[PDB]
Amino acid sequence: GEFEKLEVLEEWQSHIEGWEGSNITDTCTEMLMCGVLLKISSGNIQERVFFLFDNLLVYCKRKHRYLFRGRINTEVMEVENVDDGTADFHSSGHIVVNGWKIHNTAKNKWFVCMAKTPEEKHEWFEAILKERERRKG
């Protein structure tokens, strides 16, 4: 139950190097989705591991297994679909497939994510929506 879930969240966080902000259990109670995605930010394309919790998105770089890269309160997170074959114009550019944009409205920063398959993209969309609906009731 809820106590076990907190314990598991803190175990998870303990293995992240360079954690920023409050501890995961201050805002979160369970992990809703995780997965490896390609992230394009200012034209640099890299693999990241993304974790969606209630109230929070966290992304990290693999290799302390994970290195902290960012967090977004889901209240300030917006999403925009990108249709397959659309160009991302940052640095020398990239063709986006199974992708979407994440907008951090607190920082006014945008980046592209890409999943491996349309099913995996669909799963992320559903997870993000479900998280948003929980908070809305």
Among 6, 33, 79, 97, binds Cl ion (CB under 5 A): 79
* Interface with Cl ion: number of residues (CB under 5 A): 8
Evaluate the CA torsion angle 74, 75, 81, 87 in order and state its sign. Answer: negative
Query: With binding defined as CB under 5 A, does residue 1 bind Cl ion?
Result: yes
Among 24, 69, 94, 131, binds Cl ion (CB under 5 A): 69
d(CA 104, CA 16): 22
| Listed ranges 15-23, 76-84, 88-96, 119-127: which one lies at the site for Cl ion (CB under 5 A) | 76-84
Report the candidate in 111, 79, 83, 109 with the shortest Cα–Cα distance to residue 96. Answer: 83
| Listed ranges 16-24, 68-76, 94-102, 113-121: which one lies at the site for Cl ion (CB under 5 A) | 68-76
Residues engaged in binding Cl ion (CB under 5 A): 1, 3-4, 69, 75, 78-79, 132
